[PDB]
Design a protein around this ligand. Structure first.
Ligand code: A1EIV
Lengths: 309, 472
């Protein structure tokens, strides 16, 4: 008689918070009615079945057949107008259309527009007014973002965006017009062994401001500094590489020729012997080596930075 | 069936009674191990039996006593009880953990030097991230996400798998704020090692799913692409085979946005995962859930307008597993189309009932690319404004990916795309009007609106301003 069942159903359907959900669900479970089922916030990505579920939840069950025949989905639902309801879907009554619009505004206020919005415009609209967020889909579908809003006019909003109320348009326009105005490190690694340590080194260096290239001579050209991953058997291909078949051999020879900082990183691999290696590459052994610690990766990266330029 | 459940029920009662009665750390661990083996036996069977055992654990209060063991000081009982928990966090249990279990698991995640405990609590976080949005914010606002990242720093294989799944589930079930927090907390960089490493294929597959789900958000694409993680998605998807992974519904509702992402890597990942699911679940009797979701239509749209081989192959094989026949590719040069091309395109876009009407009026590429509201409403029989708007959406889809070389002279389509990817739909109207790159600096609003067909005023204003400014 009071209308408590409908209010609790609206509470469950658009709930963002666990305790209210639990209380309303248990209250409705005590009653004969079955619990209303939660809706996906990402309405622009909805399908026909999501629309049917939302219609059944908001009480407009009699129009489920009409929405199904016309195949309304998230885009259609979020860009539904007076004429489409009046003629296409069968909502002849202006009262019924106004009720459906109230519930559509309810849905649009709490919706996920990340897949559509690019400049976080929904937060801007909400910051102007909590009820302004219903217009986010219209604004983004129009192609507008935070930067593009300072060239918007009243007629554009009214016709394309769908902001019927003049006061909302005036506030939005005024607010917009007023307030809206070569890698550092090259990584050379063995594919089988060095890859994981190379990944850790690259991500650590990029976190600390060092650009790193991973995965060819022009790559050695662009590198500010050269880092060789001494994985277990890193120079296994490089040993006796008279033909320079290994890519690592070519890269390091080119690095020595250019003079880029070459920093060997020993992690589980012994220093290769000079005699077995080609004579040109015996110089990299003289360069300082860095131990890598699983327990302290940040300490090793700090040591590299201290050696890094 | 439930007969195995009836057999396990006395075993469940004995194991739970021994676990609760045990006071010593080793005896508690032994009872927990009994429950662990029983749960794994049910899992190896099958899903209903394990769900029933988890239900019995909840009814006995064994999950609350399990939490009590989580607060226990001894390391071994904590570790192996956490293994039990990560095995039993089924959906109803995640609720109760969301209620009271949260706030203790965070305490476990604060200290992670023990490898097995770290793995177990990482799996527990992985399972809890899927439950709900408030759980996602509560975990991410705390040190849970930092724990996941630091675990990704470690080299434990099962731990890395668990953290990849955790980040993926958090991405799917987080929301705008949660995913923006993950992006600010450098999630993509720490996902890079998991995807790049060649040791485990499933690890890279899960990390690629996570990074694709991040890339589904338009704002996140900045940081995900600057991270460089998505570059590994396409070679990976090209490499691995869905069938061997098959040998090895709400989640499908999460995956389908990947097919409709408009992003290459996200579409590749979605196609692969949905093809694997289609294979394994078509091995089963029923195949209706994919049609309930709308996956068949999304895959058909993927094949029809595909520009890339791997997505084409995945969507074709996925639809070939199903009873539907593969949608047939369309010729990009739409202005040169004929009646049969229009019929094929209509059948592919779902407007099969209007094929007769289009055939009688003999619609072709020129007519299709210069169709208006009135012509559909009266001539072709699309009385419904909803149906006309749907047809317009698909017509814009076709016009965005079309070959205008036979018509365009000054490479105007690239100019329109450079202003905006969705501006390219107007290229045929502009060129049919006789406009080129040089002629645009004398165009007016009324000319665009009437002749070119740019109905939206914002698009017209941007086009005119850009032409007048840069074209001079
Ligand atoms: O609630 P969900 O995630 O659907 O599954 C329930 C629990 O089952 C465990 N588990 C393990 C090994 C095989 C299987 S089938 C399931 C998962 O770790 C999850 O915690």
């Amino acid at each position: 008689d009071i209308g408590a069942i409908q209010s609790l159903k609206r509470l469950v359907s658009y709930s963002t918070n666990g305790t209210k959900s639990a209380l309303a669900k248990r209250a409705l479970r005590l009653l004969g009615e079955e619990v209303p089922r939660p809706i996906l916030p990402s309405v622009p990505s909805w399908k026909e079945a999501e629309v049917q579920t939302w219609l059944q939840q908001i009480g407009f069950s009699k129009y489920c057949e009409s929405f199904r025949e016309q195949q309304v989905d998230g885009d259609l639902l979020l860009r539904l107008t007076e004429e489409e309801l009046q003629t296409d879907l069968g909502m002849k009554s202006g009262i019924t259309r106004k009720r459906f619009f109230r519930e559509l505004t309810e849905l649009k206020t709490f919706a996920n527009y990340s897949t559509c919005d690019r400049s976080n415009l929904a937060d801007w609209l909400g910051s102007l007014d909590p009820r302004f967020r219903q217009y986010t889909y219209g604004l983004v579908s129009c192609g507008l973002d935070r930067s593009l809003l300072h060239r918007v006019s009243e007629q554009q909003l009214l016709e394309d965006c769908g902001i019927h109320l003049g006061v909302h348009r005036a506030r939005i326009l005024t607010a917009a017009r007023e307030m809206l105005h070569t890698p550092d490190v090259f990584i050379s690694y063995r594919r089988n062994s060095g890859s994981q340590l190379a990944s850790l080194l690259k991500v650590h260096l990029q976190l600390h401001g060092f650009s790193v290239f991973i995965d060819l001579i022009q790559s050695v050209m662009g590198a500010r500094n050269f880092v060789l991953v001494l994985s277990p058997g890193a120079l296994d291909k490089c040993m006796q590489d008279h033909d320079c078949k290994d890519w690592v051999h070519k890269e390091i020879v080119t690095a020595l020729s250019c003079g880029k900082n070459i920093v060997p990183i020993i992690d589980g691999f012994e220093w290769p012997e000079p005699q077995v290696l080609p004579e040109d590459m015996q110089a990299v052994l003289t360069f300082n080596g860095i131990k890598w610690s699983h327990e302290y990766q940040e300490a090793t990266i700090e040591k590299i930075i201290r050696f890094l330029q | 069936v439930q007969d195995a459940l009836e057999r396990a029920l006395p075993e469940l009662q004995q194991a739970l009674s021994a676990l609760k009665q045990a006071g010593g750390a080793r005896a508690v661990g032994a009872g927990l191990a009994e429950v662990f083996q029983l749960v794994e036996e049910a899992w190896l069977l099958g899903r209903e039996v394990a769900q029933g055992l988890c239900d019995a654990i909840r009814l006995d209060g064994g999950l609350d006593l399990l939490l009590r063991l989580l607060q226990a000081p001894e390391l071994e009982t904590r570790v192996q009880a956490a293994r039990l928990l990560e095995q039993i966090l089924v959906a109803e249990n995640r609720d109760r953990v969301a209620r009271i279990g949260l706030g203790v698991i965070l305490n476990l995640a604060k200290e992670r030097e023990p490898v097995e405990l770290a793995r177990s609590v990482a799996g527990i976080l992985e399972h809890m991230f899927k439950h709900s949005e408030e759980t996602c914010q509560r975990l991410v606002a705390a040190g849970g996400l930092d724990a996941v990242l630091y675990w990704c720093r470690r080299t434990d294989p099962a731990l890395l798998r668990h953290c990849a799944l955790a980040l993926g589930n958090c991405a799917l079930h987080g929301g705008q704020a949660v995913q923006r927090r993950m992006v600010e907390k450098r999630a993509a960089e720490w996902l890079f090692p998991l995807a790049f490493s060649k040791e485990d294929e499933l690890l890279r597959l899960h990390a690629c799913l996570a990074v694709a789900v991040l890339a589904t958000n338009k704002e996140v694409e900045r940081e995900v692409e600057r991270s460089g993680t998505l570059a590994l998605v396409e070679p990976l998807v090209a490499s691995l085979d869905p069938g061997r992974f098959a040998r090895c519904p709400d989640d499908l509702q999460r995956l389908v946005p990947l097919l409709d992402s408009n992003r290459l890597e996200a579409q590749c990942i979605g196609a692969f995962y949905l093809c694997a699911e289609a294979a394994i679940k078509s091995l089963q009797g029923k195949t209706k859930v994919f049609s309930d979701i709308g996956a068949i239509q999304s895959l058909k749209r993927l094949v029809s307008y595909s520009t890339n081989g791997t997505k084409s192959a995945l969507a074709k094989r996925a639809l070939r597993l199903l009873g539907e026949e593969v949608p047939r590719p369309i010729l990009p040069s739409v202005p040169s189309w004929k009646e049969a091309e229009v019929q094929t395109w209509l059948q592919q876009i779902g407007f099969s009932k209007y094929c007769e009407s289009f055939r009688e009026q003999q619609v072709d590429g020129d007519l299709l690319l210069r169709l208006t509201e009135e012509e559909l409403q009266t001539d072709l029989g699309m009385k419904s404004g909803i149906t006309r708007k749907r047809f317009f959406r698909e017509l814009t889809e076709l016009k965005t990916f079309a070959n205008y070389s036979t018509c365009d002279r000054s490479n105007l389509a690239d100019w329109l795309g450079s202003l905006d990817p969705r501006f390219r739909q107007y290229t045929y109207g502009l060129v049919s009007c006789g406009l080129d790159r040089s002629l645009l600096h004398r165009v007016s609003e009324q000319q665009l609106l009437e002749d070119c067909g740019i109905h939206l005023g914002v698009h017209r204003a941007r086009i005119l301003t850009a032409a007048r400014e840069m074209l001079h």
